[PDB]
Design a binder for this molecule. Structure first.
Ligand code: IVM
Lengths: 210, 16
């Protein structure tokens, strides 16, 4: 039931959300873990190596470059963490055999990052999993998150809402197509962006490092 | 004393 405009936007997003791989040596991280203070050195990389993907994905979002310049910065400063939690969640249930559950905890350190990072990311994943959401839903739901016109430091909210709007519009349809049985699927997807905004306090901010 | 926002400025082209 999507319109040309939507199917076009969707494909574009899918495509882009895809050039970020390489699922093979996500096994180097999956099994056989050189653990402990080793494990730090890897994530710190991985993190870092998530920003460059994030920003590549964002530049190619229909209308992004056309935004202001600082607006562009403030978007991304606002999304970096949210969008990493959303990446994790896809992994934690879409990749990986049958969940429960990396369960390293008897190996959690700081960063500073302790045990109040573990628990958050847990409720969240299990709740996203509970949504049994397809990749298209991960892709769009991610652009919805970057293109958020209520980030602090935006000057042209309506410039950003014009861009977010169509993507919300598509996601609604997909929902209303792939699962008409439960007319409250879209509302749950939105609902989760809120647990995202929340974690933005317990992960005070990921500035500086590394 | 960077901190983040610079990183993003760079990543927007330079730091590739
Ligand atoms: C992640 C940093 C903080 C600490 C998070 O850590 C924890 C909890 C606290 C935060 C949530 C725990 C930590 C990682 C994350 C959860 C991460 C995932 C579930 C997955 O990764 C996500 C995020 C990752 O982001 C970098 C992202 O890849 C980035 C960079 C990639 O480059 C190419 C880029 O392709 C990609 C698109 O983008 C990735 C796609 O998907 C999963 C990959 C990570 C598993 C990590 C582990 C599994 O076992 C490992 C080890 O045996 C151990 C001891 C602990 C685990 C751990 O320590 O896991 C472990 O290292 O949560």
């Amino acid at each position: 039931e999507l319109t040309p405009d939507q199917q076009t936007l969707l494909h574009f997003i899918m495509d882009s959300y895809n050039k970020q791989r390489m699922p093979q040596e996500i096994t180097n991280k999956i099994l056989k873990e050189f653990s402990a203070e080793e494990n730090f050195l890897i994530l710190t990389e991985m993190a870092t190596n998530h920003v460059q993907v994030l920003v590549e994905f964002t530049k190619k979002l229909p209308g992004f470059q056309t935004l202001d310049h600082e607006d562009q910065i403030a978007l991304l400063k606002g999304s970096a963490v949210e969008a990493m939690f959303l990446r994790s969640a896809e992994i934690f249930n879409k990749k990986l055999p049958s969940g429960h559950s990396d369960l390293l905890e008897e190996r959690i350190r700081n960063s500073g990052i302790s045990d109040e990072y573990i628990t958050p990311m847990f409720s969240f994943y299990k709740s996203i999993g509970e949504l049994k959401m397809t990749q298209e839903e991960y892709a769009l739901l991610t652009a919805i998150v970057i293109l958020s016109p209520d980030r602090q430091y935006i000057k042209d909210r309506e410039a950003v809402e014009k861009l977010q709007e169509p993507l919300l519009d598509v996601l609604q349809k997909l929902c209303k197509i792939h699962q008409p049985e439960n007319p409250q699927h879209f509302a749950c997807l939105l609902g989760r962006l809120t647990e995202l905004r929340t974690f933005n306090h317990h992960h005070a901010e990921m500035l500086m490092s590394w | 004393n960077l901190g983040l926002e610079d990183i993003i400025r760079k990543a927007l082209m330079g730091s590739f």
